Amino acid sequence: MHALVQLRGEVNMHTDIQDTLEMLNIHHVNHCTLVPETDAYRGMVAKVNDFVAFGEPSQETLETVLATRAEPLEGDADVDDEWVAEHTDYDDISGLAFALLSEETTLREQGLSPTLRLHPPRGGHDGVKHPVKEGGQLGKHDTEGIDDLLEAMR
Amino acid sequence: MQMPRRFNTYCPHCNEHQEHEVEKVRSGRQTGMKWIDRQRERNSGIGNDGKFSKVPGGDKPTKKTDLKYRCGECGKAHLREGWRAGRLEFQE
Amino acid sequence: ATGPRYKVPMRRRREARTDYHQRLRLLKSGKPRLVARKSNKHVRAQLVTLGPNGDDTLASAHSSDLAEYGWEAPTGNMPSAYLTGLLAGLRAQEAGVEEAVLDIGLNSPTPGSKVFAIQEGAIDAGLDIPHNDDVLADWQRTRGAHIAEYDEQLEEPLYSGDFDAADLPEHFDELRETLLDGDIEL
Amino acid sequence: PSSNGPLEGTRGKLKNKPRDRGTSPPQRAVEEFDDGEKVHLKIDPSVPNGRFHPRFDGQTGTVEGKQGDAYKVDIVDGGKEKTIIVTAAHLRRQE
């Protein structure tokens, strides 16, 4: 399971690429979604490769972001352990995070918005003109690499 | 091209194949009593006569076949689509 | 054979056994084919249908298995051909086959030939097959009369082994009569 | 295009690879299809008759009856529904 974050805007981006991001529930910059590692989903992220940051996050990181940015299908309600417990098939955020990572469920199945609306990266990111191997922030990331970004966009 | 004066083919009247004779359609003479003839006289006056002041068009490089197919037994003719032919000569 | 661009005919075309242009026209009828084939000593008749992996023979008869019913004469003649067609046709009727089109392969459509004799046989067995009566040999020749009259110019027996001296088109009748009979073990 | 006939720009699609040259096997020309069956359209260069407009090569339509020995296949050209008259010789079963 990988974490997808849009880092590049819609202006001038191919329509078929933009539509791919929308099918992945991301409609704004800094919006994140969790995607299972299947052949079908793999093709989608590869197509979006140049306007996104992705990679498998750690259990902890996912829990921090879920706690801080997860939302119900509708409404303001904070998604904390109690919320997770009173609305989901799990006992707390950790159980949900683990399930998401092991691809046993999805945010929607548990009554949560498929989108984690992140905050801009504190301290700024590495740039949207180059991929990770060139010092940029685009493309596939290391688990440590994704965590750094996700935590900075806490 | 060449073409047989007589040959077996379908007669739409007899409703069966029979020997037909092929002849080129000879132009029938005009009577000068058709409506268009009366309109020409009626409408022609002082100055330009509209459509009646026009003169005969030109010629296509080759004309289509204009034939009559006569049934050799019932004596009734029928017409067919023509085809472009520079010349058409009958064999016999 | 000569290079990458070289065109090798279909196998049955190389072997000179199948006329593919004729085959297509034959298959257009949608009906089963009455495959009439000859050999120097025998005559074969098969009712073949089209199949996913190749032709299907639903019924057949060989001039050799003619003896099984009481045939003591040679097997590469007119009477032999007719009877083999009738036998195949009868077996065809038993298999649920009602109609067929005559396939003569690479043989010639010669009037009074053995393939038409095979055809007449199958038709008499009950099979509806597109045909033309004046292309079939007259009854007597099918019986084998042409051979008896040939032996009439004796001096030396036509047949080497002893089936008979003057030959018997009557034997043909006996066999046909045996086949047209309802009982018969097909 | 310099001309607008049916065979314009069909040099490739209507030509056989040298080895597939010559009269095609009869088996596929006599194949039978049922209404509802999905069929791929592809002209066989060696078979003159029973063809369709070359523009439709590669289409995958639905057999919806027949006219004589030829089949009536339904396709969608862009957004428009069309009916194509074509023989088995230029058709193949999908899957």
Place this chain on the structure above:
Amino acid sequence: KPASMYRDIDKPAYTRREYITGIPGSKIAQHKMGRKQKDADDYPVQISLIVEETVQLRHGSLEASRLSANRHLIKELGEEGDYKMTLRKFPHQVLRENKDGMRAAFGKIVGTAARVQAGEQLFTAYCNVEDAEHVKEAFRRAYNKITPSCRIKVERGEEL
């Protein structure tokens, strides 16, 4: 006419003589020079002039460079020196000129050029160890008459 007009490969390959008439003859006199009766393998040293940029070299340039190169080899090794030089490329690409303004612009046929990809051997000479510096000099003069920068590369030769 300047080479600036034809040096680039910005046009389709235009070589089909069955659809092109009035093509000027090539000015290139020879492609095989020196002792053409001998083999290249009969020499210890093999030096090639390599083109560093992909370009088109007009037949007039091939002749001028080949001439100035072989002419040197002749002057230093004699009219029958023990060496052999080869110009491996042939001017296949036909050239046009629109010589009315931009109306019916398709140019009339004016010449021919050889398309050479970067890294290719334009010239390859074969000589003995003694005459190695002479062939290097012929090539120096040769690369001054063709558009691209070149490399004088010693292939078979380690008396260095």
Place this chain on the structure above:
RNA sequence: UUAGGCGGCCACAGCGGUGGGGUUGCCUCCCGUACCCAUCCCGAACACGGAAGAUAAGCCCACCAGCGUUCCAGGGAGUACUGGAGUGCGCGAGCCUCUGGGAAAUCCGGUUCGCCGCCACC
């Protein structure tokens, strides 16, 4: 299928070559023209009638790779080319990096001298 008939795929099946196989069995070559039929001339062929002879042809069986073909390993080659991205480089033609794909020639070693279906048949 101890030799047959009709085929499907239509060279992995072609080209070329070696060895083996037939008393009332099979296919043939073979023998022969009164007939059905036949040659713009020839029973050559086609057609019909037939077994004295033969396994030399064909055919069937076993096998050889020199040529042609199919596929596979390794090498060429992740090269050539290329879909997506870049305030990367270059005067410029053009190149490079990241991401997703990925040849052809040729060399070398294997493979391939058909496979499969229905029917009939010591």
Place this chain on the structure above:
RNA sequence: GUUUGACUGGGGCGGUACGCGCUCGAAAAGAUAUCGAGCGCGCCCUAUGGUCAUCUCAGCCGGGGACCCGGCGAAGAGUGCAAGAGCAAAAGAUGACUUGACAGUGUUCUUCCCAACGAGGAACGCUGACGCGAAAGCGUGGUCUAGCGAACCAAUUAGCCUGCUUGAUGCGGGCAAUUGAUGACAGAAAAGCUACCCUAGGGAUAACAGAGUCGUCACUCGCAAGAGCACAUAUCGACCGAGUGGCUUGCUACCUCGAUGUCGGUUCCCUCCAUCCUGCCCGUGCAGAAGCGGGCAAGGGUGAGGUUGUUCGCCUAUUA
């Protein structure tokens, strides 16, 4: 009284990319422009159509560029005509027979990708009548893509409907269809001049200036064959190659057509250097003198006249 068309790197001249077919352009589905590259069609054929039987071709080899025999020979022959495609017991050849190049009426595709649009074309049926074949079957012209034409009117084909109170006769009007042309080819019946001109507009489009380009033009550089009595490099300097300028010319059509006043000249001001003189230098085929070539250098100077509107240029006498 009117007409005298359109397209178009402005317009005219030329051409027709004004109706059609093929290869390529076209970016491996489909679609795709230019006065894009190659080139065709406005017919021809009673067989050069149709079917059936028999048969297999180019080309090469061997035996007696005509003929005869044998062998090799998947296709290079032939198939009316462009091009591309198709075809070998055939779609080709030979022979024989035959008239389906038939009447009627449709389905569908095309024309017009997608996506509406006529004529025309094609594919595939049915009804009727036929041809050939043993039969399956083939024949809705030519193996496939060019070979085409509205309404009105006339002529023609077969039957029927109809013309003002009514009957007879004459002569009309109509349903279906064939033929006759509009090539500017989805169809007007059609020549020019205007500097005597006029209006509407356009910088949607030309002349002039500007702008882009730099083939042309000007100048430079690299290499240095060559000659210069010997000597590449005092001097001259080919070929080829690389450039700089924006003075000429050409191209483009960005700017202005509710106007940015023309050429040449003159007068008055500033500037550039690729330097003609002058200053300071280097080389010399530098004795001197007079030169030739080169470097730095734009301070100053670079003038007067004869022909020509001339710019330019030719010519004269002066001049550093």
Place this chain on the structure above:
RNA sequence: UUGAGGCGCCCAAAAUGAUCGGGACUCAAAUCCACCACCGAGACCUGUCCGUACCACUCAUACUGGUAAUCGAGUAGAUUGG
């Protein structure tokens, strides 16, 4: 002696007053390899409100409550309330 790479130098002439936007900069305020911390939109996050759409209630298109990560730019033009 010879091979390769980095930066620079020569080649390098234009018209009113030179230029990297200017000043000005040389172990840089240049260039290349790395790295650290910051500044900086109406983007993104967040409070309140408005419009529009939809939902619940309603006679209501009057209130009230709810939903919008998946509503909020716009020439010609179509539609509608004032």
Place this chain on the structure above:
RNA sequence: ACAGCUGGUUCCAAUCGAAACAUGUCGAAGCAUGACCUCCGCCGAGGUAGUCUGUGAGGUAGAGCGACCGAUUGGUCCUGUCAAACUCCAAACUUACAGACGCUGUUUGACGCGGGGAUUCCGGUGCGCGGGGUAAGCCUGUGUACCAGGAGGGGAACAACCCAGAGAUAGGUUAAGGUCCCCAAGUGUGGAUUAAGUGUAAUCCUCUGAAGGUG
């Protein structure tokens, strides 16, 4: 008088939101019919902008030609080259259909049908692929995104280059870009090169700088 030509056509707001193309036209400064925009009524459960897989279509790039074809070297089999109108080969990629996931639709009615009303048929630029042309801020295609009709941030200025798509108001954090001054933020750190003021110039009509040469 008529004009297909120029000019002008007067209050507020909310929703949607183009076409600068195709066919025909005495037509190219105009129309009509399609494409596309919008509004209304109808239908009633699927739909398909993305990806994956399966079943099909294809000869462009590249490559190669003792595989055709036609070009194109030399020597006494060998040796030297090519193709827009060549192909024994052959991608990436585009594309028909189907399934799966995704997204969407069944009170926001999708997909589709029927009807009213248009506007539009001078387009332009960037990138990729092009064809013509010495070239062009050239002409003419194609796919896509943008300008046109797109604010705000950056780029000295500057339709289409970068960030970015935007209700009002308010706090905060970033993007592009930038942190010596002008000017918000470093005269930041480790290390090396450059002496030319090279340079302090992504892209570009716009920022030149070449062949050749450099103890």
